[PDB]
Design a binder for this molecule. Structure first.
Ligand code: ZN
Ligand code: ZN
Ligand code: ZN
Lengths: 217, 198, 200, 219
């Protein structure tokens, strides 16, 4: 079973540096080209760098060129991406992939790299309250606003995972302040609001923040 | 490099995605498929077929299965370097569905925190394209809101959308009437939801 | 650095544009108005145009929208070692829905004799701007081999027009029979499809 | 009687250099902040550079990072923008403007087009968009001209040497993947006039000194 496992991702200031790793299994990185590909949030795939099977040497995208450096360890088959002088534009999910020769037939699970001046901060959770004016037929809407957190990701559940139907947790938006914000909503029968409690469970692992907010009229 | 383009299609449809050859000098092309939150997959091409339209490269799906709805990327290699083309998101076509609209005033807890966010929710609609216009004391707003859209729902293939108006606490207290106005394919007239502060 | 956001309004409406500020506090603003094909104009405000600062965000208000106010507005902020223009807000004229009239044009024999083929689909005088064109070649849904562009809001009836051009090699064009563009739009209760068979 | 006239815009290969000029009239650049602002097609304004009055201190956007140089000649009363190491994303209409609570850039030049690309200058091919039974509906017929494969911008189109303007739509050019531009100009007319009236699109492409007429006839 071929398998690539990544690590080393995280949060850094502009001008800082990080080192990504790529643990290979079921094969050795000697007989294959290894590539790094990144994907910024909501954007397309971008090739970063590659290294040859036999000898080393390198090929880099113009956007990187002389800021990152790809390498590998033959003994412990592991590819590396030494990122230096990072900028905000380098914020993306980074993948490592094996090229066979036809194409990148195996990919790592990917790892998030955030480059920003913002400090780590947990979300403030505010209720989006149901109301008698906020119905569509017998259906009522309610939710939770998860505001001003950094970095990604946050996870949201409702009633500890018991409530999934009708739930919409929207993609985060990057505000001008450098912090993220999103809402999670759910539609339920208005007749249930009297005898049903609704709690959004917000988890922000990067800040060790766990919040449970009850939503009521 | 940029947001993927969109293509609406039904199950059983035939789709052909063209990839323009830049200035390469070989037929080195590879196609990938990516679903939300997951790594891309190299396309192994039965219903998938690759060809050469003029000098350009094409990928054809003879009969779309539910599992085929995803973002597709064309990759050209040199092979001293690699380039990904813009993504092409293949979306499930369904009947037009008008959104139901809800507005949410800022909580007292948020005002206590020094900010006021007003949220407009658009639920269960199709197509994805919808316009939300904010009004404060009957003044049309611009530059102080942001939108966000879910992926296509697995069950009914509809979308939901949130629009958030962000104002300072002090400014929020200076106005009374807050409203979001929704425009959409399925709406013959704009739908407005509003509230009076207090 | 990005496309201008769009705002639909009518004569007499009140419009407030917010300048999305950064590390301002100590910052000053200037507002500009630009119409198609012309340089921007500095806006002098206080009397139809007024402005103020609500916190870190500058605002520009149009008290009563006039026909000559429909344009694209930009805020310029300047401070110590910083000058930037914000995203443009394009204020366009709101009007009743109008369905496009659709026309399809096969490649001319002239272009074919020259070794190329361009199929053109025309969408004429529609509102709102939002419109989707889908090309079909022998009922195969196309993507990535066409381009489109749209005119500014018409000075006559405030509608838009759109052209979509499907580009193929001559050889590829001549081995398919049915060419069609399917138009989706507000004013259309059902999608309109214009098509032709090659060689008729 | 304040005016700013720009020049120097044109085509250049990536990595190449260009010097833009901004000739002032009705005032001297010595006494005012002079600014350069650019605008890519379909995109918003982007501030590029500025130079201060009396002392000629300068300021640049991060995006033109030590590649661009703004200067002014007070004797010739002209401001300049020296652009080096040009990249495709520098392609835009460049404006120069004079600065003067109510302060701002109150006078602007007409703008000059800068195109950065590896493509070479080429005149357009003009093809007819012929009217027909399917190009007509309930009285009106649509016809036009396809102006294909030219570089750089701009092309201008008129109909019947400027006599026909009503119902004319000349769309924005699109940049094809080939690197060449293309645009269409269309006009709607009464179907009954197709037999009588003649329709000619007049195409002009100054960057190649190309002039082309094309009579558009029913197929
Ligand atoms: Zn829903
Ligand atoms: Zn206010
Ligand atoms: Zn028209």
């Amino acid at each position: 079973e071929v398998q690539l496992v990544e690590s080393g991702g995280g949060l850094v200031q502009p001008g800082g540096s990080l080192r990504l790793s790529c643990a290979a299994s079921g094969f050795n990185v000697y007989y294959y080209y290894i590539h790094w590909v990144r994907q910024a949030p909501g954007k397309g795939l971008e090739w970063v760098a590659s290294i040859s099977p036999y000898y080393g040497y390198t090929s880099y995208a113009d956007s990187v060129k002389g800021r990152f450096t790809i390498s590998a360890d033959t003994s412990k088959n592991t590819a590396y991406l030494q990122m230096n002088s990072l900028r905000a534009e380098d914020t993306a999910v980074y993948y490592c992939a094996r090229w066979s020769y036809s194409g990148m037939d195996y990919w790592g699970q990917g790892t998030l790299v955030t480059v920003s001046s913002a400090s780590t901060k947990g979300p403030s959770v505010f209720p989006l309250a149901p109301s008698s004016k906020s119905t569509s037929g017998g259906t009522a809407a309610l939710g939770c606003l998860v505001k001003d957190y950094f970095p990604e990701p946050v996870t949201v559940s409702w009633n500890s995972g018991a409530l999934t139907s009708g739930v919409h947790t929207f993609p985060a938006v990057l505000q001008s302040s450098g912090l993220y914000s999103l809402s999670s909503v759910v539609t339920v029968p208005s007749s249930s609001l009297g005898t049903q409690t609704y709690i959004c469970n917000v988890n922000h692992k990067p800040s060790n923040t766990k919040v449970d907010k009850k939503v009521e009229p | 490099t940029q947001s993927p383009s969109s293509l609406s299609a039904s199950v059983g449809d035939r789709v052909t995605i063209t990839c323009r050859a830049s200035q390469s000098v070989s037929s080195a092309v590879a196609w990938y498929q990516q679903k939300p939150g997951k790594a891309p997959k190299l396309l192994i091409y039965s219903r998938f077929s690759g060809s050469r339209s003029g000098t350009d490269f094409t990928l054809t799906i003879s009969s779309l299965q539910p599992e085929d709805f995803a973002t597709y990327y064309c990759q050209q290699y040199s092979y001293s370097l690699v380039t990904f083309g813009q993504g092409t998101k293949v979306e499930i076509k369904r009947t037009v569905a008008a959104p139901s609209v809800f507005i949410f005033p800022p909580s007292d807890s948020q005002l206590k925190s020094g900010t006021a966010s007003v949220v407009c929710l658009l639920n269960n609609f199709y197509p994805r394209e919808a316009k939300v216009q904010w009004k404060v004391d009957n003044a049309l707003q611009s530059g102080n809101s942001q939108e966000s859209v879910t992926e296509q729902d697995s069950k009914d293939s509809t979308y939901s959308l949130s629009s958030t108006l962000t104002l300072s606490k002090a400014d929020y207290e200076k106005h009374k009437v807050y409203a979001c106005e929704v425009t959409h394919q399925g709406l013959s007239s704009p739908v407005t939801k509003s509230f009076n502060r207090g």
